[PDB]
């Protein structure tokens, strides 16, 4: 029996007309929906999923360079030029150097020097955008007691009709709540690891980055963040890569929480919805059975739940099944008027075998009352006291 | 008999003492020196020669070039530089050229261009300096009648003692006259030809030239006079030699007079000297002969010379030789009182054979007189009239 121990549980009742009922859904929460002559079905909102995230930025933390070259010129011979400076893939550096007779120049002065190297990224990390169009809410609806359907709902597709076997179907219509969802974070990935990071911090990471997804060939920006050029030779300049920066990010990610992405879809926790659900086509069993006639027995003694309700487990020692279960509460007993109400509304034992067990959940009135199971002389009762008031 | 028909003839007489006699010597002239009881010897100054001329300037009229190269630069790439521009042997040219995308530059602008070529001279012409130390005067002294010595005299060696066989020696002391010699000309040579040129015109010849003699390797100046640089492409420039210029000088040398240099010495015409000549050791034959006794005969009738003197040729039909010739002039003919004077002073017939001929030159007095040859009854006479007065 579901939603029994859920702390964040809600009880919604049905209108006089009997179609519109409003609910609000929390992740890690439940809503018990009761309506007049209706199966009393539980809605959960169990899973929030994101998928198909458009990539915003991709930062590189491990670089490599090749074909390094330099060009020099004596004073009064102009600026140095290598074919590679206008090439966007290469990172360059231009400076003046003291030239003279000792370096192969006919005079002593500052000469032009340029040095370039092709920058390639060996290992990159990726940031992805989390927008409403990427969301996927998995909501499970279950007959409180084939009889539990799961549905998935998009913000671009709010509706879904959950089908329950003999009970018809429930029609979910929802809309995304404003303020209780994410927009200020990105889905940072890093060598099959995954995190959630403040996108504001994300834009200020001192590493090379390109602005699109992996288009044609990525044009990296701020290549000097990993590549520095060592002081100054007269005709050369030495270029060095910093190497792997994975440890720097793993330590910059101190408080970040991890996620799980067993495929292309990313799992995480929270979620908040609001839903009008249509029960016009929800029915209790289209066949009216007779009552179970044999003796019942309390296996689990009545036990109070967090919300004031009580749960009872019986085992019906008869074969009449499928028969309705005679279950009510009574303050008179002589005889025999119902008080309170059942949560497991219209209990039915479909089991045709001998010693079928069944759990019930009753909503006792305040004060004293008797839980009554069975019909005839061999019926069972159990006192129950509930405290509090309106 | 020398100096007989010379138009520029001079007659110098002897002092009472008999050692010092002044003369002035013209090229193409003669000086007859008569002294008391002396051989009466003729000085000429026949030749003026120059030698060992220090070369002043050497011009080139035929050039050739090799290893031509160029260096270029796009705008903002500095000045062009080839190793051979600081090399003095090469002639270079530096200019700007329109550069652009069509010439292999990322810019449109004026680019530096230099072009150099090695200049070598195939054939040169030379100018030589004519200074007093280069002079050489050849003076010939001859007994008027072994008996003619030639002497050479330098301005750095003014003296020379001419040796005549039986007559002793004449001592020449001279000094170069001031103003009647050359200094404003050079000895221009050109492919074994030779000229005299005004050095002022020589310093303005538009051709390559070096300033010394052929030292180490000649450094030529004004190489652009033969080497012009034709129009300049973006990366190249064409260099061209004019070729031989010999005809240009042969036509610029319109009025120049040629010389002759059969060896390292160059002989030419003019010359002027002045000399004291010492006749203390000049003697008439140290033996006193007797008079010729046989008959004389006039072969050449007495003929007047340009200077009023007269010449007579006799043939002595006697064997007395060596005998002194009786020759005088007389106006009385009862007595043989000498009048005028002999120029062929103290004539001697050294010939011992039968019909020896001899030429005499007499200096007749003004008016009438008789040329008297011989001594005795068979002596010959010839009337002679000379016109003019003191």
């Amino acid at each position, epitope marked *: 029996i579901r939603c029994i121990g859920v702390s964040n549980r809600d009880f919604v009742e049905g209108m006089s007309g009997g179609t519109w009922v409003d609910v609000v859904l929390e992740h890690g929460g439940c809503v018990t929906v009761m309506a007049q002559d209706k199966p009393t079905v539980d809605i959960e909102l169990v899973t929030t999923t994101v998928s198909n995230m458009a990539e915003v930025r991709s930062y590189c933390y491990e670089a490599s360079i090749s074909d390094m070259a330099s060009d020099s010129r004596c*004073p*009064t011979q102009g600026e140095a030029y290598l074919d590679k400076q206008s090439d966007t893939q290469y990172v360059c550096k231009r400076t003046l150097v003291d030239r*003279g*007779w000792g370096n192969g120049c*006919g*005079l*002593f*002065g500052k000469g032009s020097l340029v040095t370039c190297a092709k920058f390639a990224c060996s290992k990159k990390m990726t940031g992805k955008s989390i927008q409403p169009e990427n969301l996927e809410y998995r909501i499970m609806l279950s007959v409180h007691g084939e009889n539990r359907a799961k549905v998935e709902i998009t913000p671009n597709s709010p509706r879904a009709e959950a089908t329950l076997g003999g009970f018809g179907s429930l029609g979910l219509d929802c809309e995304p709540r404003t303020g209780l969802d994410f927009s200020d974070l990105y889905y940072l990935t890093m060598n099959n690891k995954h995190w959630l990071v403040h996108k504001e911090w994300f834009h200020d990471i001192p590493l090379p980055w390109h602005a699109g997804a992996d288009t044609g060939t990525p044009h990296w920006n701020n290549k000097e963040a990993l590549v520095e050029f060592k002081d100054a030779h007269a005709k050369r300049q030495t270029v060095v890569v910093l190497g792997s920066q994975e440890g720097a990010v793993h330590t910059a990610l101190a408080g970040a929480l991890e996620a799980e992405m067993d495929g292309a879809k990313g799992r995480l926790s929270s979620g908040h919805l609001k839903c009008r659900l249509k029960m016009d086509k929800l029915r209790l069993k289209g066949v009216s059975y007779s009552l179970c006639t044999a003796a019942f027995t309390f296996t689990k003694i009545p036990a109070e739940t967090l919300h004031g309700t009580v749960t009872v487990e019986v085992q019906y020692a008869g074969t009449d099944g499928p028969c309705k279960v005679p279950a009510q509460m009574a303050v008179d007993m002589q005889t025999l008027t119902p008080v309170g109400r059942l949560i497991t509304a219209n209990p039915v034992i479909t089991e045709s075998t001998e010693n079928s067990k069944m759990m019930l959940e009753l909503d006792p009135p305040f004060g004293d009352s008797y839980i009554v199971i069975g019909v005839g002389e061999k019926k069972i009762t159990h006192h129950w006291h509930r405290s509090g008031s309106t | 008999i020398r100096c007989i028909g010379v138009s520029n003839r001079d007659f110098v007489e002897g002092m009472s003492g008999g050692t010092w006699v002044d003369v002035v010597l013209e090229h193409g002239g003669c000086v007859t020196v008569m002294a008391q009881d002396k051989p009466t010897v003729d000085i000429e100054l026949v030749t003026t020669t120059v030698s060992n001329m220090a070369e002043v300037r050497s011009y080139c009229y035929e050039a050739s070039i090799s290893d031509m190269a160029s260096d270029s630069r796009c705008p903002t790439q*500095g*000045e062009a*530089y080839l190793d051979k*521009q*600081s*090399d*003095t042997q090469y002639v270079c040219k530096r200019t700007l050229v329109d550069r652009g995308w069509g010439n292999g530059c990322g810019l449109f602008g004026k680019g530096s261009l230099v072009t150099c070529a090695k200049f070598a001279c195939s054939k040169k012409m030379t100018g030589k300096s004519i200074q007093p130390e280069n002079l050489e005067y050849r003076i010939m002294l001859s007994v008027h009648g072994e008996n003619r010595a030639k002497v050479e005299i330098t301005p750095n060696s003014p003296r020379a003692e001419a040796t005549l066989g039986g007559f002793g020696s004449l001592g020449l002391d001279c000094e170069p006259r001031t103003g009647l010699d050359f200094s404003d000309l050079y000895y221009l040579t050109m492919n074994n030809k030779h000229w005299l040129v005004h050095k002022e015109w020589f310093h303005d010849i538009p051709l390559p030239w070096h300033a010394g003699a052929d030292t*180490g390797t000649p450094h030529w100046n004004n190489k652009e006079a033969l080497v012009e640089f034709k129009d300049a492409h973006a990366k190249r420039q064409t260099v061209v030699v004019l070729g031989s210029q010999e005809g240009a000088v042969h036509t610029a040398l319109a009025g120049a007079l040629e010389a002759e240099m059969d060896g390292a010495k160059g002989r030419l015409s003019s010359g002027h000297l002045k000399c004291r000549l010492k006749m203390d050791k000049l003697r008439l034959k140290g033996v006193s002969y007797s008079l010729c006794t046989a008959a004389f005969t006039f072969t050449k009738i007495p003929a007047e010379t340009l200077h009023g003197t007269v010449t007579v040729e006799v043939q002595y039909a006697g064997t007395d030789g060596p005998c002194k010739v009786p020759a005088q002039m007389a106006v009385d003919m009862q007595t043989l009182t000498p009048v005028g004077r002999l120029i062929t002073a103290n004539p001697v017939i050294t010939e011992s054979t039968e019909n020896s001929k001899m030429m005499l030159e007499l200096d007749p007095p003004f008016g009438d007189s008789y040329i008297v040859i011989g001594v005795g009854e068979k002596k010959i006479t010839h009337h002679w009239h000379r016109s003019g007065s003191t």
Partner: antibody
Amino acid sequence: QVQLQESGPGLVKPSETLSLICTVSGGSISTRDYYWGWIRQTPGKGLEWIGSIYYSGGTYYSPSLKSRVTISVDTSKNQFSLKLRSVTAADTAVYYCARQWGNYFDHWGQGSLVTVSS
Amino acid sequence: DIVLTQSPSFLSASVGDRVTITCRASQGIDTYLAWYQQKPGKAPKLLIYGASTLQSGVPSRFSGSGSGTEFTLTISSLQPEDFATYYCQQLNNYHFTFGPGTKVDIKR
């Protein structure tokens, strides 16, 4: 304060070799920052550079005199030497030794007059 | 080689005047140019290097400016000891070469 002093003013015969020594005071010669040069001056009054040399020994000569010039260093005695050969009357001049601070001559010597005649 | 030119050649000024001397290189030497001072019977004295830097111990009167090919040495408030001929000097292609010199006489 570096001081430079060329060897005494001297007389040289034509076609013989001119030999000068300038000795450095007030500072080192085995230093990496400076060069060490020779500069002439004919009377009236042009300055001509002859050549410079490194304490290591590396020479740099004018192309107009390269074939006649030889410059040497003696780091142990803090001096350097100029040698011109095949001297003529055109080489009569005052010869200066100078410290070259890479592109300029920051310190000079008093100068030594060399006269060339027989 | 680069042949430097200097203007004017001679000039007579008077104490207190401001004198300007110009130097011209055929090729771009950007700022690698010097000015020297040579009094009679003495060695040159480096005044300016780098075409605008004053050398230590040189009076504030002297200054230099220029880039490329045309450089200018300026003498504020000329003094009677400033008698000298001034030379510009540049180095290029392992070759030192000096200017022709600007003689500066004093008028009083």
